[PDB]
Amino acid sequence: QDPTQQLEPFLKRFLASLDLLYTQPTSQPFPNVESYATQLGSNLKRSSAIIVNGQPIIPSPQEDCKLQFQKKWLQTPLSSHQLTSYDGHLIPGTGTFVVHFSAKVRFDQSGRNRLGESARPIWGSWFGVDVNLVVDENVMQDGEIINSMDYRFTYVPND
C-alpha cells in the first residue's frame, strides 16, 4: 500500500496515453501523424521488451520495439480503458517493480480512425485486458521508465 501510493496515478497516466484523442492545432493545416503516434505509450523505453497478445515485438535494424508498438497501436480505433484492479511489488536489488493490472477496454465503432478519417465516438462492447509491466522505481517521472510490457486481451467480444 505504502510504496504503491504512486502506483494508481501512474497506471492511469499510462492508460490515458493509449486512449489519447487526436487534436489538430489550428496553426497546423495538415495532420501530424508522427507527433500523435509518438505520445502513445510514451512511458515505454525505446528498448523495452513488448509482447502483444502473446506475440513479442522483435527489434529491427530500422525500428525499435517502442516505435513498432506505436505504429501497431495507432491502427486501432480510439480506445477507452477503465482500470479495475492492480498489484505491484518491488523486486529486491533491481531498482524495478513488477506491476500486474486488469482493465476493461472498448473501442470506437464509428468507422473513424484515430486521426478522425473515414474512407462523436460510439463505444463498442467491453474487452478484458491483463497487463504486466516491469518499471523503473521512480514512477512519478513521466519519462521512459517501462522496461517491459505484456499486453493481452483476456476476453474478446464476438461482435
Swiss-Prot record:
Recorded superkingdom: Eukaryota
SUPFAM superfamilies referenced in this protein's UniProt entry, alphabetically: NTF2-like
One Gene Ontology CC term in the entry: nucleus
Nucleus found in the keyword field: yes
Major localization class: nucleus
Alphabetical UniProt keywords: Nucleus, Transport
Subcellular location, record wording: Nucleus
Residues that span the membrane, as ranges: none
Record's subunit section: Interacts with MEX67.
Described function: Affects mRNA transport from the nucleus to the cytoplasm.
Designated name of the protein: mRNA transport regulator MTR2
Species in which this protein is naturally found: Candida albicans
Species classification: Eukaryota, Fungi, Dikarya, Ascomycota, Saccharomycotina
